[PDB]
Structure formats: structure tokens, C-alpha cells
Symmetry: D3
Subunit: 171 residues, 6 copies
């Protein structure tokens, strides 16, 4: 009903599950109930470096909706929906298979601050490296999980990934 966005994949809707810079409570929405659940408390002393959530009405390679990191000037509360522009994607493989993480900034009607951020490489490399580091290490204390983090790909690649996931949801 919220949908992936009328202008997808150029701008997409993201339902936030975890706020930027929050305590490590990992919420997740249930598709059945529509309820927000605590999936876990992260066992590592790490925090999500962006707001984190998913694009409704998408099926990514691993069967779940596409996950998105939304960089913003302030945290967005879990359960809120935000319109965002994909700027890149971090490829990674984990215990679920292919589990890429799209990186996005707010749509310009939501905040003009990130207007000149078009690809992930327009952001500081140290910040991009913090994201890679986060996914590389946040699951290290969970013995049956693992993450092998790959490379960043550009906004175009992130948009094609989203396109594929939207088509998978229609099928």
C-alpha cells in the first residue's frame, strides 16, 4: 500500500526500522501483522551509521525486501516512511546469501542539504569505510552468521538492483 514509490527507482520509499545513531536495538517489521518487533539487541557495541530500513513491495536476491541505509541530518523514528534517492550500493554476501545494502539520501523535496551528493563517492571515504566496517564486524559475536563485504557500486547500479527487486515483486 505504501509501495516502492511512483518515481522508483530514481526516488523510492523507505520504511525506517532503525534510527541513525541509536542504541543497538534492531527492530524489524513483520509483513503478516504489520507490527514492529525487536529482532535483537546487537551483541556488539556498534550502532547503525545511517537510518536503516526497507523498500516496500520489493523482493531482493535473498527473498527479502531491499535494505536501505538512509543518511540524514537527524534520526528518523522507526515506522516512519521517507522518500529517498539511491546514491550507491554496498555489495555483500552473508548467511542469507546476497545481501546488498543500498545507500540513499533524502529526496530534495525532503532536504536540499544532500543535493550535490549523487554517488556514494561524493561522501567522505572515512564514512563509507565506517559502513563497510559496520557490516564486516557487527555480527562477529553471532557464531552462525557471517558477512563478507565486497565493493561499493554507483547510483546507477543501485537503481538497477532496485528495478530488479520491483520486477521480482510484480512476478
Amino acid at each position: 500500500d505504501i509501495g516502492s514509490g511512483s518515481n522508483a527507482p530514481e526516488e523510492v520509499n523507505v520504511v525506517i526500522e532503525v534510527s541513525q545513531d541509536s542504541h543497538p536495538v534492531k527492530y524489524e517489521f513483520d509483513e503478516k501483522n504489520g507490527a514492529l518487533w525487536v529482532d535483537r539487541f546487537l551483541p556488539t557495541a556498534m550502532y547503525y551509521p545511517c537510518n536503516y530500513g526497507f523498500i516496500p513491495n520489493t523482493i531482493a536476491g535473498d527473498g527479502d525486501p531491499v535494505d536501505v541505509l538512509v543518511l540524514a541530518r537527524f534520526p528518523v523514528m522507526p515506522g516512519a516512511v521517507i522518500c529517498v534517492r539511491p546514491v550507491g550500493v554496498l555489495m555483500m554476501n552473508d548467511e542469507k546469501g546476497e545481501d546488498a545494502k543500498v545507500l540513499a539520501v533524502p529526496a530534495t523535496k525532503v532536504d536540499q542539504y544532500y543535493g550535490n551528493i549523487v554517488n556514494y563517492s561524493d561522501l567522505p571515504s572515512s564514512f563509507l569505510d565506517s559502513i563497510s566496517h559496520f557490516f564486516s564486524f557487527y555480527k562477529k559475536l553471532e557464531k552462525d552468521k557471517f558477512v563478507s563485504v565486497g565493493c561499493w557500486q554507483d547510483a546507477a547500479s543501485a537503481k538497477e538492483l532496485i528495478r530488479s527487486a520491483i520486477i521480482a515483486a510484480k512476478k
Copy 2:
């Protein structure tokens, strides 16, 4: 379904969209989905001086539900509903037309702290002026928006405005 309140306009229900004293994330509910959206991040370094939301099942002069500023001792989270007593209304005209802002305090069963606050003029003038100032200036960096702030009117006037909006919703 929540409705404007069984004792409207003397006490009314307000669905909170923005918490008092919060970072400038302007959430808004969608009537279609029922989802909370990020409308924008305020471009100005301002914050809502009260909790802010709307009375369900109302149609104000500008076609939207009546907007209410709810002064309280602590912030109320977005999406929560609170029963409040109108104490005044700040008249203003903006890019949407007539866009008055009702000022309210919690109903006495919710908090007796504001029991002797009956009209807006029972609150400090500096606080009332901060509200006028907020609406006067918070949109200054958005070129196609504008606000011309008028005068405060008393609790009786605020209640009649609400009555009109409730009747408009029935029609």
C-alpha cells in the same frame, strides 16, 4: 475512528505528528495509508515549541484537519493520541490560505498541572511570542512558502473554529 472527541470542542483528540523540543524532523500522517511520513527536515534551525498535531475528523478553512500545538510537561511521541483542552488560537495566513494554529493543554485527567491555564493569555507572553516568531520565520528559507501571522484569540474563539471544522467534516 479516533474521532475529534466525544466532548469536542471543549476537549478534543489530537494525533501528535511532531514532539515538543525535538530535532526539526517534520512528520505528517497520510490519510490514505495511515502511515507517518517525513514531510521534510526544516531548513531553518528552529524546533516546534509545543507538541504538534491534528484533530481527526475535522476540515479547517484550508481543507486540512485543524492543527494544534499541545503544550505539555514532556514530549509526546509521534503517532500517540492525547486528549486536550483548547486555550486559544493564533490566526495566520500562509501559502495554503487560512492556517490558524490552535493552542491547547492536556485535559485535566491527563495532567492537572495546567488546570489554571484557561486562555492563551494565562501563559507567559514571551512563550506566546516564541510561537508567533516560530511561524513567522520557520519557512523563510522556502521561497514559495510564506506566513503572515495575525493575533491570538481566546479559548472561546478556538472552540468555535473547531466546531466549524467538525461541521465541515460531517458535510
Copy 3:
């Protein structure tokens, strides 16, 4: 629809109404609408010492769902659902009649931190006493309310209370 949990009473679902260590805004869910309401601001300068909420699809002795205090490492937001293991119950009588408060910790899949907490008596007595103190005094400024706090009972007793409330909900 969320239900009391497939493994109830050994592990149960709790819908959080008030976050641990929060300002004293007492939210409550409405069964009719499904909306979160502000019931009141506590008139006393006290705060809930654990996350606080209820087990869906239960009818306790006083006609309401079973109330649960969920101890966790971080606050859980109101409206989130968490899977918990009961560890004890504090008996008390108040203006509603029998109003016991179950004490729980997260299920081990949610956080292994509390793995060796099996009964309430595995927690510090000073903390248990803070809970008794909270219910003893938080309503003292509300003249028509009262609480007479009894003794703690063990995890087994808490589970049987929950069982009874689940059976009452089926009937």
C-alpha cells in the same frame, strides 16, 4: 493477531507501552482503535524502572491483559513487540483489584545477556525493591487510586498466572 506467543507461557509476546528510563508519559494502547494514547503524565517524579507493556490476548484477574515489566539493556520504543521470558511476578492489589506485575527478560534469541537470570531472585535485591517501591508510591498523589504491594513469586508462579490469563481469553 500478535497473540500471546506460540511458546507461551515459557516465552511470551509483550507490546511495549512505556520505555525503560523514560520521562513519565504513561501511554496505553486502545483495543478498539489500536491507537496509542497518552493515559496520563505521572504526577509523581517517578519513572518506569523497566520497559512496561502487556501480553496480547490475555485476560488477567482484573479483566485487563497481563502487565509485564521487561528488563533490557536499552529502552524499547512504545508500540514495539518483544519476545520475553517471565522470571517472576510481584503481587499487588490496587483500585482495579488484583493487579500483579510480571517481571521478564528478553528471550535468549533476542539477547543472551540475561541467560543466567531465571528467577526474579537472580537480580539484585535493590533493583527488585525499586520495583516494589515504584508501585507503592507512584500513585500516592492520585487520591482515588491506591496500591498495596505484596511479595515476589517465582518464575513458575508467573508462568501459571499467564496460563490462567490465556485460558480466560479463550473462554
Copy 4:
């Protein structure tokens, strides 16, 4: 060095030790080092309902500086100094002996909001009662302490208490 205030007792300086509405970490300054110490974490699930600190260069009846509750619109950080106007005093006996807690608001030059608060009785009774309840119950789990809370006295009384304490510090 900071001193009690050039306009004492009409306006006095208070060094804040505990922020209003904060987690129950009770800091205390030490006069020897000027260091801020954690005296204790409150065992009870209570919080200071006003900012709390002391007037430098005073010796109250019990040998310590005059303690002051400073009501303000926002919390003030421990170690900051604020110029305040006494509006009343709450008499109490405790394990410091014959004690008293002055109630104050910021001086008008610091915040105009409370400029019309002349005496403690200009604040809501429900809030004054919350302060009395706080001192009556916050130490109840510490059986090596006790608090017997008396009555409120007016601004003139509070100022006289302060006058004497300043005189006592001069001698």
C-alpha cells in the same frame, strides 16, 4: 570565588549539581578539589523534578551550603552556574539534620518565562506536591536515612534563610 550573588537574597547564584528530569545520577561538588563526584545512583526509580544545586559561600543551619531547586524550561548541566530568584522554601528534616530546600526560578534576565512567579504558590499545586513527594520517598530504600517533609514557606521566608546563611558564611 563565584560567591552567593551581588544582589542576594533577591537573586542568588546556584551551582547546579543535578539536571532536571535526568537519569538518577546524583552528583555533588567537593569544596576541597572543586571536583564533581558521583555521590550515588538513586536506588529508587525517581528523578529530580527541578535542577538541583547549592548557593556558594553560604552556611545553612545544618553546616552545609543552602540547597536550591531551580525550575527551568530545560535542564541545566552539572557544573554550570545560574542566577535565580528564590520563590519559596520546603522545610524538611533528614539525616543532614534540620534541612530546607529553597525553590527558585531563573532570574528574568536569564529567562522571561517565570517573571510572574513571585511565590511558590504561583506554581501549580500538583507540582509542589510532586516535590514534597520526591523528598518524602526518594530515600525510602536507604534505611540509614529518613526524610520528614514539612510545609512550604514563602519567598520572603526563603530570602531570610538565605540572608542568615550568607551572614553565617561571612563570620
Copy 5:
């Protein structure tokens, strides 16, 4: 004692007085005692969009130390010292006289994030405009004050202002 910085004006020391994105409590250090004071609560519903403080051992044109806005990824507590790189300066006249606010980011050794910010014009224009708006309107409710905001000047200009202020403090 702390001094303006061994590498000034390329990197300078700033003692923080107000945290970025905080409640509008405007602290100020006093040079006599070294005490942090509450100067005021802002009457307006605005917040400092950067951390805000001063360069020790400087005398700007108006007689006070050089004031600096320090943009950072997280707020810095009042009283902390941070090593920063000036990137520009916002000229303004106010009730302190011919004033100026230096804009800086942390030195690269403190945070790599802003290492590519060379001049104020490398930051988003929408944010620079937010800073100008803040100074233009934050004092509007204090009719004994006024602010006339001028133009931004570049990093080289900011550094020259600082050079002169250091020289002035030496003489």
C-alpha cells in the same frame, strides 16, 4: 593556558560553550573564575546549528575573543576543547558591535569526515543559509538587541581575522 593553538591560524583551539543541535541553553564561560554560566535560555524556538564557542587568548575587534561555529558529526559538551580548521567567517553587526562568526570543522586528526572541506562554500548552501537565518532571527524577541547579518568570506579571510585577534591579545 589552553592558548589559541600552536598551529594558528591554520588550526585553532576552541572552547565549546553550546553543543550543536541542543536545547536552547546558552552557556558562556567567564574569564575571571573559569566558571560556565547560563547566560540565557533563548526566547525563540531556535537551536545552535553548529557547536559554538571561542578561541582562548584572542581579542577580536569588538573586545571579546573570537567566536567560532564548529560543525561536527556529533555534539561536543560545553567546556570541552576542540582543535579545528577555520573554513570561513560570517560577518554581522549586533549589540556587541562589529561582530563576526568564524565557521570551522574539526582538524583532520580529530575527524577525517570534513578533511575535504576547504572553504565555507564546500558546505551546502542551504545549510549556510540556515546559519545566516539563525543569527538574523534568534534575538528578534529581545528588542534590546539586533543583528544585521552580512556576507560570508572565505577561509583565508577567516584566518586573517584570527591572526589579528591573536596579535591583539599579545600586545
Copy 6:
């Protein structure tokens, strides 16, 4: 001035530099000025899982004061002093050389909660592992640093380390 503690090494004084569970601003005190400095913002998306500070008037093997992780129920502000009981020590080598991080809880007089924590092994293993993981990975993006984390040793070992460091500071 503050000193290591009259009851050292059974209870020691720790000056807090970083609050538990805080944003990754790593403050450090300077012994020359007594000023609190921002050393860095952590490049990684990690947070200190305990309060973190040092024991005054100690010289550990590597030349610096003894560093201490203080687990507590709430964060303690930087610059505050707290009396703690050592319960263990985590050995590690890093760019400071042969390092060690003492683990402590508040003294019983400060909080009764941890009164039954005698050794590090009385705390949950999952949490001890989180501490080890923090030191193993928090500096991974700083290639001019490295951390090789060793084993936990018991309270008696921690106290002996502290004893030696105090002796070293006396000589």
C-alpha cells in the same frame, strides 16, 4: 589532588572521560591544564560499552595512568569522579604499547546494584565478549593503530596492577 583512593586498590577513584552508551566522541583530560579535550570522533560506528576514564596519580607500565571501564546503570558525565571496585582486567597490546583495561563497577556506597559482582566472570560472557570485540575493532579504520586483545584476568590481578601503578606514581 583527587588521588587514586584512600582504600586503593580495593576501591579506587576514576575520572570519567567517556560516558557509557554515548555518541563516539572520545574526550581526554590533559594533566597540564586539567582541560577536557576532544581527542577524536571514532571513525567506526562503535560506542564505549562502559563508562571510561582513568585513575589519577597512577603510572601504568606504558607510562600513562591506569585506564578503567566502569560499568554502571546510567551514563556518567565526562569530568565526574566516581569511586569504583575493580573486578578484572583485559590485557591488550596497542599503539600505546603493553596496555590493559581494568573493569570496575561502582562501589557499594555509590550503587548497591553490582554489590555481588566480585570478579569479571560474574558478568555475562556475552557482554565480556562485547568489550573484547570493541577493543579489537574500534581502531581498525586507523591503520596507524592496532589492537591485539588478550585474555581477561581476575579482580586480584587487576588490584595488583593498580598497586604497582600507584607505587610507580609515588617514586
